[PDB]
Design a protein around this ligand. Structure first.
Ligand SMILES: Nc1ncnc2c1ncn2[C@@H]1O[C@H](COP(=O)(O)OP(=O)(O)OP(O)(O)=S)[C@@H](O)[C@H]1O
Ligand SMILES: Nc1ncnc2c1ncn2[C@@H]1O[C@H](COP(=O)(O)OP(=O)(O)OP(O)(O)=S)[C@@H](O)[C@H]1O
Ligand SMILES: Nc1ncnc2c1ncn2[C@@H]1O[C@H](COP(=O)(O)OP(=O)(O)O)[C@@H](O)[C@H]1O
Ligand SMILES: [Mg+2]
Ligand SMILES: [Mg+2]
Ligand SMILES: [Mg+2]
Ligand SMILES: [Zn+2]
Ligand SMILES: [Zn+2]
Lengths: 521, 637, 48, 372
């Protein structure tokens, strides 16, 4: 442990765990430098193959001409014939969980060189093998020295992923395993049943999760008009209906995913947060769930409780998948190609069947337009369901029945989260299906039918429906169809994919519109 | 002392220059340009610099190419000497009143040397690297004394001394710290002769990894670039930049016994400002004679306006007059600067209030992508500090100051604070930002055209209500918007099926070089701020649609080479329409003020610019008033 | 990039009493000896 | 190498305000609370100096706490030129500085508590945490290094010989483990533990039952790495003023292992929120985990849970929903673990509980936090 390093470990190999809190800029260290005397032309070379890890410089230029008067330090470095290597200063710290309550957490300076540089980022939990060494620079003291670590190896653990920390490279057998898994005729069921098998009675929501994880195919029109392929799903529901647990599972199973709240995490943001640099005072992207999870999904719980600074940002980053930062000096369109899975509670704790979905919710009504599919997770107080749910939840709690039956069901009917995550990555990186012309015509006919019935329902009434069917809803059904086609690696979305997407859209945002007094018959 | 290898490389690069005649043509053109305005004035003097294509060098001599890329300190000085020798060889006609060292700049494919400040490591040192990044700091352009000339009055003689530093040469010299001569060799006091001494401009910029490619949540990496005597002031802070230069190491890095490591920086050879969307760099485009011929050919057509209107956003169905207004704003009017100092605005602002999903944001994103210079902002995502200027004892330009002579696309305009609203009030009509803060009284130029999107009060535009209650925006603010379009999502079966067939046809699109089920790749389009007219893919199935790059070329040509003059035959129509609009009672969407006379004038001028006409005729005024009457009422006359 | 600042002086006042041992008093007395010494009504050292 | 002698039971016990120049270079025995500790640093003990003329490593030279030593004589080449300590072959001893401040109770009225610097050498390091009342026996000496004061004034230090707490705790032996296993078998043990909690708090028997349940807690469960359930019992204490709620929190801090006490407003010993903060004196950044991170496997005791900042509310809410603290600040993007059991104490919304109104509208905090 970092707090257990005494003076007996000095100049010895020590293994110590911790978290990286700083990674300095790479600095150039001379590993072979040509030198020439000033009041001469005596060419010499100084080779530094060892002792590259030290705060000071143990080997300096000669203080004499070495040709044996020229003077003190007569050598200059011929920089165009010298060779340099990279060095980095890391700052390890004991993990803040195991720290005395009233004392400063203890940190330690580390130096790495050559191929051990740019291996870890700040916040990474690491295992450092190194030499516990000493340099002279912890204030008032006599004969005291500053300890540090010459890194001989870094062992990073499983940490936060990113669009930069993506393999995109499948081993040959892994492609073959995924491809065999793809022809499986019951692939829709095996992937649906693998969405939180512990949550019970949410098959349509699980299909929506599958479609969101797949997502539709992106289009880049010749105009530059980008059409979005990612799917956004909202879950409005009674408390205790598993909405958060299905968000946590989506975070776990997605390749890249960030789970946050409406107001963000404890210190993490939610959208692109441009901040001044800690030392250089230069604008940089501090973070944000929507930019950190670029290329994946963000699971926003308590979506209703969110600030207006994040409101417009997420509204922009769901249709255009881009956050347009424009501050005093910095203006940039940051890519935010992220699917959004949101969970929200009704303004009153329970969902009011009497009132429409709008005015039963805290946020703006038109926000319901931005989401592709909206699931009203009402709670049914029927006892058959109550007994079944209680039995299931007890099976979860030390019954150990669900774990065993899931392991049994994994043999041909369920997929592990690692394998399913890698399959999601492969499907997103390999398939982007289109629509057959007949499928497109029937989609158009279906959309016209829905919109005409909405017009009929709204003509006789006075106010407008809380959940409106707009052109965005048509473009969403298209996305669901393409996600269903991409599920089985189908290059073309046929009639069955369209029918399944239609059924999903009737299950959510149409049953959700059924409770609307104006959106209903 | 002469070096045999140096001469061999000099003659090899001379052979290279002889093989590719474009370099004698460029040097000859530069020399004749310099001589011609030297004799003319007994404008500006072009620098003695030549852009060298590394691909041509690789074709000619691959080792010379690899030597320049890998060992620039040994191959660039010989090539520059060869270029200087060639230039002094062609200099049969010297400029009025070897010599005149010519510098080299490089372009082409760098391969593994095309890097970023993050990937630029210590094993790229002493290599010719191209680094792409964002300029965060630009130091003062300071003169550097490279030759001091002194006068001795006792002898009446002029002396001089040349100065050299470590950054002026790619190779390392012996350092010679020659002192500043305060006296002659024999004791005579010297007087410095400023104006005969030689000072060379020197700048030190900092290039940081671009936000669009830097990792999220990680501290960015920066690199220093040094520019000398012609690359200074080539960029401004916030600019996307591509700097080609030698990654040099300087000093001793603490080895010389008197630093933690060696001091490294880039000796800039070439600076390319890059065009990225929502940045402060405009989009220069190369207009060949074929492009200008096609532009004039299409301008001769009567319905060219419509051809340009439909080709803007074919993917969006409808919104035809909105597209006409967007094209007119892209052209814009001509600003008037009267002799007394007053300013008349020539920029067209557009507001689009509408129901959810009527493509207001897609029409904003298209304008952001296709405009020469466009900055994208969102309401309350950028404040007045973020929109207008900000005091940091120094000023940092905001959204509407960087977008000077450009377009500002404001999404969610209704969700904007009043503190921002007042600054926007100033920016829209007077086209200026007055700071007057913390002892900094400055009037920045914000001559930008604003296109904005907004939602109604209740989220759905109620046709029963009146616009003034549905907008909930200050009337003085709505006056500044030249064209206010209220778009409503009316459920009608004909347009319902037509918009759905369009949406599906657009979704059923394949690029020319892609398979049926291949995910379309996407780059960030870092265009360089310096082949068919019509488009193959037509979502509508009809007039012809021109490609977006050709439309940008046409807009650039009309915007930079056409300045229409108003005519009496247009003035009669403009005045009649303005008088009718002011006096006729029609329950207009927006109020009618003297600003309405000027949006008539501006739209007429913009439509005249569309036709490449230098005079605003009667048809231009009629169509401008037509669009305005549509925008105010909804007429189709 | 400026020149060398100059330093110069000028007599304005009587300073402290000329002291006999001062190098400048000794130089003055030698100069007076050279200019004023007479041998047989001849300024021998001046003429020499 | 050597045995260190720890003199104990010194008769003359001084106070830090009673130390004068007559006690210099002598052995004193002071008492006080530790207020700060400055890490652990190596200090030269057996110095071997490398000659830069030969490359010779001169033999071990004993260095002590007085001043650094230097060598000017070589043997192989007898050079007197630059001689560098060889860090690799030098031997080091542990060194620590502890600020010892007079216990506030013992200070006479009107006088401010006095502090000294105690130097712990090679065996006493990391034995006295801040806030611990200890008796330091040591040597009272002058730290030699005058013009700021206008007088030749010297600072003083206490080089500690033996340090001990004047008055591990949760550890058990085999006999104690057998005693635990036997006393558990007795019937009615649950009620005995419930009555054991808070033995100066009258009644409140349901509160004590909940406190015992939270102190022992449940067990966390993962189905297959796919469904997670917390194994911590969060207990809220909604009470009127003078209901002893704070005392049931201080008792939990008494009895719980890995217990962190925080407040919605007041003494900010811990901030409830993880932040990357740059320390203004030591120049270096620190990633402070929140009060919910510090008690990763224990209990977090919040007083004034009715009144909290939006930042603290968000931190507590998301650490109760996910059992983790996500932070993306100053280039650090990480998810710390906060698998804590939360015991909160709140005052009703208004001053007194209203039985006619439901609990949701009787207190400031709302549905999402109350559910957890
Ligand atoms: N159908 C279900 N099957 C299994 N567990 C369930 C089910 N419904 C609820 N639970 C459990 O109920 C507990 C709390 O549910 P949550 O996921 O927090 O509900 P929620 O509806 O998201 O609550 P809010 O709205 O976020 S306060 C979790 O531990 C779930 O495992
Ligand atoms: N049941 C009780 N047994 C013993 N002392 C009690 C009891 N109830 C209240 N007190 C005393 O009443 C005082 C209340 O102090 P606290 O325990 O801090 O109360 P509190 O509920 O935290 O008050 P607020 O709400 O913070 S003003 C203390 O002196 C307690 O010792
Ligand atoms: N009239 C239309 N023609 C074509 N596409 C449309 C139309 N109206 C909406 N859309 C589609 O709706 C989607 C969302 O539109 P968007 O611009 O985000 O709406 P809003 O202006 O309300 O923010 C886009 O994919 C866009 O192509
Ligand atoms: Mg929840
Ligand atoms: Mg919009
Ligand atoms: Mg209290
Ligand atoms: Zn020499
Ligand atoms: Zn020696």
């Amino acid at each position: 442990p970092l707090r257990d390093l005494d003076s007996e470990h000095v100049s010895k190999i020590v293994r110590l765990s911790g978290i990286i809190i700083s990674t300095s800029v790479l600095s150039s260290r001379a590993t072979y430098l040509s030198i020439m005397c000033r009041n001469c032309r005596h060419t010499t070379s100084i080779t530094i193959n060892n002792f590259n890890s030290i705060t000071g410089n143990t080997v300096s230029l000669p203080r004499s001409c070495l040709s044996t008067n020229c003077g003190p330090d007569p050598y200059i470095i011929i920089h165009e014939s010298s060779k340099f290597i990279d060095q980095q200063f890391l700052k390890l710290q004991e993990i803040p969980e195991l720290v005395p309550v009233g004392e400063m957490p203890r940190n330690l300076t580390m130096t790495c060189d050559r191929y051990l540089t740019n291996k870890v980022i700040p916040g990474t939990r690491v295992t450092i093998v190194g030499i516990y060494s000493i340099y002279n620079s912890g204030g008032s003291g006599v004969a005291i020295r500053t300890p540090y670590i010459k890194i001989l190896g870094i062992q990073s653990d499983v940490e936060t992923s990113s669009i930069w920390n993506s393999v995109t490279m499948f081993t040959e057998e892994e492609e073959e395993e995924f491809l065999q898994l793809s022809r499986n005729p019951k692939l829709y069921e095996i992937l649906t049943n693998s969405i939180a098998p512990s949550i019970f009675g949410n098959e349509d929501i699980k299909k929506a999760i599958v479609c969101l994880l797949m997502g539709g195919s992106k289009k880049i029109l010749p105009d530059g008009m980008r059409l979005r392929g990612d799917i956004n799903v909202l879950l409005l529901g009674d408390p205790g209906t598993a909405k958060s647990q299905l968000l946590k599972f989506v975070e776990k199973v997605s390749p890249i995913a960030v789970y946050t709240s409406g107001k963000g995490s404890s210190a993490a943001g939610l959208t692109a947060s441009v901040q001044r640099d800690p030392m250089t005072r230069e604008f940089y992207l501090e973070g944000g769930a929507m930019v950190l999870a670029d290329g994946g999904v963000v699971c926003i719980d308590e979506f209703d409780k969110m600030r207006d600074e994040d409101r417009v940002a997420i509204h922009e980053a769901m249709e255009q998948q881009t956050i347009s930062i424009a501050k005093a000096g910095i203006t940039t369109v940051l890519n935010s190609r992220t699917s959004v899975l949101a969970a929200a509670n009704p303004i009153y704790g329970r969902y009011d069947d009497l009132k429409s979905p709008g005015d039963n919710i805290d946020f703006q009504t038109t926000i319901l337009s931005r989401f592709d599919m909206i699931f009203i997770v009402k709670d049914d107080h029927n006892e058959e369901r109550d007994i079944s749910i209680a039995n299931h939840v007890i099976n979860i709690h030390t019954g150990n029945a669900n774990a065993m039956q899931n392991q049994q069901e994994e043999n041909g009917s369920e997929i592990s989260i690692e394998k399913m995550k890698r399959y999601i990555t492969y499907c997103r990186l390999k398939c982007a299906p289109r629509l057959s012309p007949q499928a497109a015509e029937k989609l158009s006919s279906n959309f016209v039918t829905i919109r005409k019935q909405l017009l009929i329902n709204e003509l006789e009434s006075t106010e407008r429906s809380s959940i409106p069917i707009t052109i965005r809803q048509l473009e969403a059904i298209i996305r669901i169809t393409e996600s269903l086609a991409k599920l089985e690696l189908s290059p073309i979305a046929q009639e069955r994919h369209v029918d399944e997407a239609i059924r999903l859209f009737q299950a959510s945002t149409m049953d959700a519109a059924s409770q609307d007094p104006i959106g209903g018959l | 002392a002469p070096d045999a290898v140096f001469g061999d490389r000099v003659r090899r690069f001379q052979e290279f220059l002889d093989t590719f005649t474009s370099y004698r043509d460029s040097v000859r053109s530069i020399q004749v340009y310099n001589s011609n305005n030297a004799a003319n004035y007994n404008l500006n003097i072009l620098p003695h610099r030549i852009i060298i294509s590394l691909d041509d060098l690789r074709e000619f001599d691959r080792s010379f190419w690899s030597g320049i890329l890998v060992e620039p300190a040994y191959f660039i000085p010989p090539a520059e000497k060869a270029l200087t020798d060639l230039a002094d060889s062609m200099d049969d006609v010297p400029h009025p009143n070897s010599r005149h060292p010519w510098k080299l700049s490089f372009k082409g494919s760098f391969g593994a040397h095309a890097l970023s400040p993050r990937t630029l490591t210590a094993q790229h040192l002493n290599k010719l690297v191209s680094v792409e990044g964002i300029v965060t700091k630009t130091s003062l352009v300071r003169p550097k004394l490279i030759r001091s000339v002194h006068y001795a009055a006792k002898t009446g003689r002029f002396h001089y001394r040349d100065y050299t530093d470590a950054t002026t040469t790619l190779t390392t010299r012996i350092p010679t710290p020659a002192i500043y001569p305060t006296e002659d060799t024999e004791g005579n006091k010297l007087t410095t002769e400023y104006g005969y001494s030689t000072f060379i401009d020197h700048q030190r910029i900092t290039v940081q990894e671009m936000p669009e490619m830097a990792p999220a949540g990680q501290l960015p990496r920066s690199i220093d670039v040094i520019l000398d005597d012609d690359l200074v002031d080539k960029t401004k802070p916030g600019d996307r930049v591509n700097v080609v230069g030698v990654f040099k190491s300087l000093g001793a890095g603490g080895m010389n016994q008197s630093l933690i490591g060696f001091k490294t920086l880039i000796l800039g050879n070439t600076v390319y400002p890059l065009h990225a969307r929502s940045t402060g760099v405009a989009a220069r485009q190369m207009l060949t004679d074929f492009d200008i011929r096609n532009i004039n050919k299409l301008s001769k057509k009567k319905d060219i306006f419509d051809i340009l209107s439909q080709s803007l956003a074919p993917s969006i169905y409808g919104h035809d007059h909105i597209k006409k207004a967007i094209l007119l704003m892209l052209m814009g009017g001509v600003e008037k600067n009267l002799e007394n100092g007053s300013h008349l605005r020539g920029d067209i602002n557009i507001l689009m209030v509408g129901d959810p999903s009527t493509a207001k944001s897609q029409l904003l994103r298209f304008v952001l992508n296709t405009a020469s210079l466009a900055i994208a902002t969102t309401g309350r995502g950028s404040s007045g500090v973020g929109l207008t200027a900000a005091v940091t004892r120094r000023l940092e330009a905001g959204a509407m100051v960087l977008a000077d002579r450009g377009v500002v696309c404001i999404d969610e305009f209704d969700k904007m604070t009043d503190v921002d609203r007042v600054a926007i009030h100033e920016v829209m009509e007077q086209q200026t930002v007055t700071i007057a803060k913390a002892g900094i009284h400055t009037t920045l130029n914000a001559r930008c055209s604003v296109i904005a999107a907004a939602n109604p009060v209740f989220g759905q535009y109620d046709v029963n209500r009146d616009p003034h209650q549905n907008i909930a925006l200050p009337d003085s603010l709505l006056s500044r918007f030249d064209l206010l379009f209220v778009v409503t999502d009316d459920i009608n079966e004909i347009r319902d099926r037509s918009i759905s067939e369009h949406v599906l046809r657009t979704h059923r699109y394949l690029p020319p070089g892609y398979l049926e089920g291949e995910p379309v790749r996407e780059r960030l389009n870092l265009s360089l701020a310096v082949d068919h007219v019509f488009e193959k893919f037509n979502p509508l199935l009809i007039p012809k649609l021109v490609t977006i790059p050709f439309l940008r070329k046409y807009v650039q040509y009309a915007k930079e080479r056409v300045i229409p003059q108003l005519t009496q035959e247009a003035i009669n129509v403009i005045v009649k329409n303005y008088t009718d609009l002011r006096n006729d009672d029609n329950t207009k969407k927006s109020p009618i003020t003297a600003r309405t006379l000027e949006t008539l004038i501006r739209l007429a001028t913009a439509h005249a610019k569309v036709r490449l006409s230098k005079t605003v005729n009667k048809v231009d005024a009629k169509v401008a008033a037509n669009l305005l009457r549509f925008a105010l009422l909804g007429e189709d006359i | 990039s400026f020149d060398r600042p100059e330093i110069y002086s000028a007599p304005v006042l009587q300073g402290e009493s000329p002291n006999d041992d001062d190098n400048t008093e000794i130089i003055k007395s030698f100069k007076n000896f050279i200019l004023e010494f007479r041998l047989d009504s001849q300024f021998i050292y001046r003429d020499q | 190498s050597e045995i260190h002698v720890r003199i104990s039971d010194f008769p003359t016990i001084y106070s830090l305000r009673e130390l004068r120049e007559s006690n210099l270079s002598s052995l004193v025995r002071v008492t006080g609370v530790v207020t700060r500790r400055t890490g652990v640093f190596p200090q030269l003990k057996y110095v071997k100096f490398n000659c830069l003329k030969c490359g010779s490593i001169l033999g071990p030279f004993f260095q002590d706490s007085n001043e650094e030593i230097r060598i000017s004589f070589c043997t192989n080449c007898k050079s007197k030129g630059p001689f560098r300590v060889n860090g690799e072959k030098t031997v080091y001893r542990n060194y620590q500085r502890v600020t010892l401040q007079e216990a506030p109770g013992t200070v006479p009225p009107g006088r401010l508590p006095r502090h000294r610097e105690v130097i712990l050498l090679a065996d006493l390091v990391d034995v006295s945490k801040p806030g611990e009342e200890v008796e330091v026996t040591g040597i009272y000496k002058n730290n030699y290094d005058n013009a700021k004061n206008g007088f030749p004034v010297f600072a003083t230090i206490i080089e500690a010989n033996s340090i001990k707490r004047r008055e591990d705790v949760f550890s058990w032996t085999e006999e104690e483990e057998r005693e635990f296993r036997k006393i558990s078998r007795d019937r009615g043990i649950i009620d005995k533990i419930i009555s054991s909690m808070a033995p100066s708090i009258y009644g409140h028997r349901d509160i004590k039952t909940a406190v015992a349940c939270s102190l022992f807690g449940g067990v966390p469960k993962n189905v297959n790495g796919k469904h997670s359930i917390r194994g911590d019992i969060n207990v809220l204490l909604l009470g009127d003023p003078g209901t002893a709620k704070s005392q049931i929190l201080k008792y939990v801090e008494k009895t719980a292992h890995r217990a962190v006490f925080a407040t919605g407003q007041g003494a900010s010993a811990v901030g409830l929120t993880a932040s990357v903060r740059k320390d203004p004196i030591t120049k270096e950044w620190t990633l402070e985990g929140g009060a919910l991170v510090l008690a990763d496997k224990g209990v977090c005791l919040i007083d004034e849970f009715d009144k909290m900042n939006d930042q603290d509310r968000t931190s507590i809410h998301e650490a109760m929903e996910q059992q983790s603290i996500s932070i993306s600040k100053a280039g650090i993007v990480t998810t710390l673990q906060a698998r804590c059991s939360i015991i909160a104490a709140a005052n009703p919304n208004g001053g007194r509980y209203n039985s006619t109104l439901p609990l949701a509208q009787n207190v400031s905090l709302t549905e999402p936090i109350l559910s957890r």
